[PDB]
Symmetry: D2
Subunit: 243 residues, 4 copies
């Protein structure tokens, strides 16, 4: 998270950290608890090549990575079959947990938006995670969960911005219809935030609008952060995740 600050302990009860087996169970991506037994993340965190389920675990909301881990095994990785790279799209994946989580005030699910939900441009939304604090700058120990408020932008404007200073033809699309953009040169998601949630409080209720997916670096001029647009994939989500 670039430009953010450390979250309050009572916020973001759905944030999860994805861990890979090595010298220690290292954080490599975020995710969100969308059902007691399912985590929503980015395909590129876990694909497109098949990975060993035994080398993946999930950690539910922690204020500081690694301090009090209680790592959870995964029973299935479901990567959207249309995924090959983030810039092509379909950058979305589910992780089925071995057990359903017992939810509490502190750890519980996020609400998915209705299909008809229109997150208007400029709506203040929040992105969270334990990623880099700027380009090639790791989050320091003790690894606090960070948050930053990022305004939604229209795809047409996000696409336009990505063409400024690029050779790509102005009619050749960069920001696809299954993506969603937010952020600016002061506030953005970054590497290691991928897979985590972009949430908007709509009339009092938090909804997950996006999954951190890509961008050209972090908080660079005319390069806002790009997310997988949750409404676009609700039908695929609900093919696996009970409603």
């Amino acid at each position: 998270i670039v430009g953010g600050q450390e979250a309050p302990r009572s916020k973001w009860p759905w944030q999860v950290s994805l861990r890979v087996h090595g010298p220690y169970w290292m954080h490599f991506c975020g995710g969100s608890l969308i059902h007691p037994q399912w985590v929503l993340t980015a395909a590129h965190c876990v694909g497109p090549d098949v990975k060993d389920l035994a080398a993946l675990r999930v950690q539910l909301r922690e204020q500081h990575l690694y301090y009090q881990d209680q790592l959870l095994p995964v029973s299935r990785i479901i990567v959207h079959p249309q995924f090959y790279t983030a810039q092509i799209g379909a950058d979305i994946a589910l992780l089925e947990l071995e057990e359903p989580v017992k939810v509490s005030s502190h750890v519980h699910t996020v609400t998915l938006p209705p299909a008809s939900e229109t997150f208007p441009p400029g709506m203040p939304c929040w992105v969270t995670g334990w990623g880099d604090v700027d380009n090639d700058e790791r989050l320091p120990p003790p690894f606090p969960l960070k948050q930053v408020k990022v305004p939604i932008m229209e795809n047409h404007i996000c696409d336009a911005k990505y063409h400024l200073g690029a050779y790509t033809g102005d009619d050749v699309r960069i920001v696809r219809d299954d993506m969603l953009c937010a952020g600016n040169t002061r506030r953005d998601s970054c590497q290691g935030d991928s897979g985590g949630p972009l949430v908007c409080k709509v009339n009092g209720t938090w909804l997950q609008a996006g999954v951190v997916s890509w961008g050209e670096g972090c908080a660079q001029p005319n390069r806002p952060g790009i997310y997988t647009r949750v409404t676009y994939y609700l039908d695929w989500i609900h093919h696996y995740v009970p409603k």
Copy 2:
């Protein structure tokens, strides 16, 4: 180049080295001289973001990088407008030199294929460059130009290999019709070879079939190297480069 040998001095008179300004004019991609004032290379070497032309030079064929440099400045970078990433495609670009070079047996242009040539399996094809000699393994000093003979694999066969060990659905095409595949687990291009030529000998004349573009790693199982298919982009090249 993986599994090469050092090229003989008399071979590959069209090979060029693209240099970026820093503590020294460092090689980052290859190219090919296709006219006395024009180099063909990969878009991803110079795009999709617009670069300062002053920080780019071209070196004509050299047997060892850096030892006898005579760097040439570039007047225009022209990147295919459909280009955004190598995985999507249109990974092709042109550099116009500030001056026409003088040709000789030593240093001369490569012939572009006619539109009809498909370069089927069994064609004798070579890829050349100053790239890594294996995954994350630099070409050592004195940086000789290397070559390797690479077997062509039909696109559909290549596409199918790319799906092995992947989550991506089998009907979601990875290897696109503007690409071409060549190489195996012994013989491949690698990072720093990008933008260089894949040339095949057809009725006694070397024709540039491909531009080194991407792959999953270098000489990895089921992951042949991928090249931009030059025939696809002849009309575009001809918008800029004279007969």
Copy 3:
């Protein structure tokens, strides 16, 4: 620490962590609390060049680095005047804190040896710290304090091992009389343990025999760890540190 285990919370109440200012207050050496206003450490951690005091803090015993920091500023760095490099010797220094700390069962001083104690082989001695767990292998998050029991080797025996596999003449002393040797190819201190304590239990009271100083690598054949011999420098310590 090589071949350790994580220390129990109730052990080693004198262990401290020395921090340097940067993107975060990063651990670079250990120390020991020998009086409420004084930390003992290795000269090479803070010398021989004079450092900005403002860029140095001390952390009192912590079970995991960084998670619950309460950093303390230092008023004086006092480095043994004979010190230039750890191989020459006098690898010993004192930090005076700006305030006296409050002691407890949790956090308290270590007892210095009487001048007469030699710490011969077979004494039960432990070394503790937050250093590497093997050569070029960091302690992973969550950075627990580690301990390992290390066998003492008499100086002359140690000196003789240091000559094995070396060109240095056998009568040119390597392991000096102000050093002490402990450890083997399973059990050793390592980088980032420097300045921390080697403590041995003598008639029911833990005495600090040594300050982690140097070695050829960590747990390498014929290369036990080398510590500054605290008895050697008692008079110097007592110039500064009260009874």
Copy 4:
């Protein structure tokens, strides 16, 4: 070499490069040809631990490393038995070549000073090599031999300078009597120059005054480069090297 420039091809005919076996025969230290069959270098290049002679080779004067190597095997490494570290001293070593070199105008020996030679303070002397061009800044390809003129300083002044900004007692010697200092914050030797020569033209004749040994970094304030003083070790040199 810091602050220098590329040498003329006709200068420094005695410079040699020491090579270690790996992915390529990499330069790691310099040396000087002091007899047709002997190279003078620094002990720390090849010691104090014993190394495999099969993994060492010598390269005679090259204008650019690696371009035209003709590597020579070594028949014996003689490390001064008083050597353990550069800061202690005796940082001098000989390498006996498998064959005597046929000397020429281009490649030939340097003259050793008489024992009585006094290189006065301020005498302009030259240091050469293929080392770093500043702290942690490698010499770029194509690796030209560099030179820099460095004035000799008296040991007493060099020692004094190393005490400025240090905790080491002003009467505790840092720059020993078997060392010699030269250089300043604009001109110095650096890492990878170790083992090479410091030469002074005395009344028309080049003599080797020093062997590059150590310093605190390169071209840092009050930290001139430190060399092994050749006159000090003439008797040891001439114990092995014919006169």
